[PDB]
Amino acid sequence: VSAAEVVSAQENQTYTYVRCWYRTSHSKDDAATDWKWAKNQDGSDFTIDGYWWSSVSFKNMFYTNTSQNVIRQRCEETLDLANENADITFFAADNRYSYNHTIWSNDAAMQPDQINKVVALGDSLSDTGNIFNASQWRFPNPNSWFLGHFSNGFVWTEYVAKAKNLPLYNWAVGTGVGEQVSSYLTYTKLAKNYNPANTLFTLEFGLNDFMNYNRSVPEVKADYAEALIRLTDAGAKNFMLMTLPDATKAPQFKYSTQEEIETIRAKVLKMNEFIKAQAMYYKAQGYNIALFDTHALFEKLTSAPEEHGFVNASDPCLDINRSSSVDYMYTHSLRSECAASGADKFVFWDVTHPTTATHRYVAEKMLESSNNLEEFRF
Ligand SMILES: [Mg+2]
C-alpha cells in the first residue's frame, strides 16, 4: 500500500458503534452468547472516532485513537451482568447487520519501550473469530462453540493477553500462515505510530498441515522458518513459540487408523525438534523468545489428567461420536459425563479442540515460563 493511500485512508475520519458480546449463561458449560451496543453513563450510544480500511471487501478493521481499556470499560458498565463468566469481547459495527470488525487502538507517538499488544498467528488453537466472520457466523455453530472460538470460551492467546492487560489482535484462522503474515504487514501499514518492537507475537501452526492436508515435514518446516524470517525482517523482536501437542491423542483419532495416527505423530515429533531449533536460532541473535513445550504438557494431561485437575482426557465434552467437519455447523448436547463433572474438568471440548479450562492451563504455564517472561519488557 502506497504512502499516499495510507495518509488518504487515515484522513477519512468517521465514527462507528461498539458491539459488546457476552456469554449468556453463568456456566462455561454453555457456549451461547448475545450482544448489546456499548453505552455511555447517560444512556446514549457509545461511539468511537477513526477510519476504516480493508485489503478486500468486508474484511475491515476500524482504527481508533480510543484505547482498548476505555472500550472494554464501556462494555462492562453497559452490560452490568453480575456474571463472573461473561467473557466479554467487542467489535466495531455500524448496525445490527455488520460483521464483527476488529478495533485497532492506535499507539501514541511517545510510546515507552515496552510490549503494548499481542499479535497472534496460527490455526484453530488460536482463532478468536476469523473463520466465524468469514462463514457469516455459521462455522463453528455459536450455540455449541463460543462466538467463533473453537472451544467453550477463550483460547490461550486471550488468557495471555488478559493476564498482561494487553490488547490482542488476531490473525489466526481455524487461510495459511504466509497469508496471515502478509495480512499483518498490510493492515499495520495503516496503523499510526506503529513500532513492531512493542508487539508480542504468538505463533503456532503445523497441525492442520499434517492432519488435513498430509503436507510433508520439510514443507511445513520451510513455511514456519519463512514466517519468522518475514516477521523479524519487518522489525518483530518478541515471540511466544510453542511445540505442537500430539493431536493424535485427541478424540477424533478414535476414528482414524493406527497407520494414520503413527504417520501424523512422527510428523509432529519431527516438527517439534525443528521448532526448538528455530527458537534457539532466534534467541542466539538476540531476539526475545519464550518457547513453551505444549507437546510435553499435553502428554502429561492425556496420560494423567487427575494430576492436573481434570477427570477426562479421552472424550469430548460435547456429545460428538465421530469425526466430521459437518458437526461444526450444528448444535450438540454435552455428553452425560461432562454435564455431570462440568466442562472445566474435561481436557477436550469437541473431538479436536481443548476446552477453555485446558487453554487457560496452557496460557498459565506459558506465562510462568522463561522466569515469568524475564526477557520481555511489559
Ligand atoms: Mg513454503
Author numbering: 30 to 203, 215 to 418
What does the literature reporting this entry say, word for word?
Vibrio dual lipases/transferases (VDLTs, e.g., VPA0226 of Vibrio parahaemolyticus, lec/VC_A0218 of Vibrio cholera, and VvPlpA of Vibrio vulnificus) are a class of virulence factors secreted by Vibrio pathogens to disrupt host membrane structures. VDLTs contain an N-terminal domain (NTD) of unknown function and a C-terminal catalytic domain belonging to the SGNH/GDSL hydrolase family, which is named after the four characteristic catalytic residues (Ser, Gly, Asn, and His). Therefore, VDLTs are enzymes with unusual dual substrate and catalytic promiscuity, which could benefit pathogens in handling diverse host lipid molecules in a proper manner. Crystal structures of the VDLT from Vibrio alginolyticus (ValDLT) and its fatty acid complexes were solved, revealing prominent structural flexibility.
The apo ValDLT was crystallized in the P21 space group with two protein monomers in one asymmetric unit. However, unlike the occluded active site in VvPlpA, the active site in ValDLT is readily accessible from the solvent region. A polyethylene glycol (PEG) molecule derived from the crystallization buffer could be modeled in the substrate-binding pocket of each monomer. Nevertheless, the superposition also identified conformational heterogeneity in both terminal regions and some additional regions, such as loopβ3−β4 (81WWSSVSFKNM90) and loopβ8−α5 (202VGGAAGENQYIALT215), indicating flexibility in these structural segments. Notably, loopβ8−α5 is located at the opening of the substrate-binding pocket. It exhibits a defined conformation in monomer B; however, in monomer A, most of it (residues 204 to 214) is completely disordered, lacking defined electron density to trace. In comparison, ValDLT contains a canonical Ser−His−Asp catalytic triad composed of residues S153, H393 and D390, with the oxyanion hole contributed by the main-chain NH groups of S153 and G204 and the side-chain amide group of N248. In monomer A, the oxyanion hole is ambiguously defined, as G204 is located at the disordered region of loopβ8−α5. In monomer B, the same region is in an ordered conformation that brings G204 into a proper oxyanion-hole forming position, due to a Mg2+ cation that bridges E208 and D263. Furthermore, another oxyanion hole residue, N248 in monomer B, differs in the side-chain conformation from that of monomer A. Unlike those in VvPlpA and monomer A, the oxyanion hole in monomer B appears to be well-formed, with a water molecule occupying the putative oxyanion hole position, stabilized by the hydrogen bonds from all three oxyanion hole residues, S153, G204 and N248.
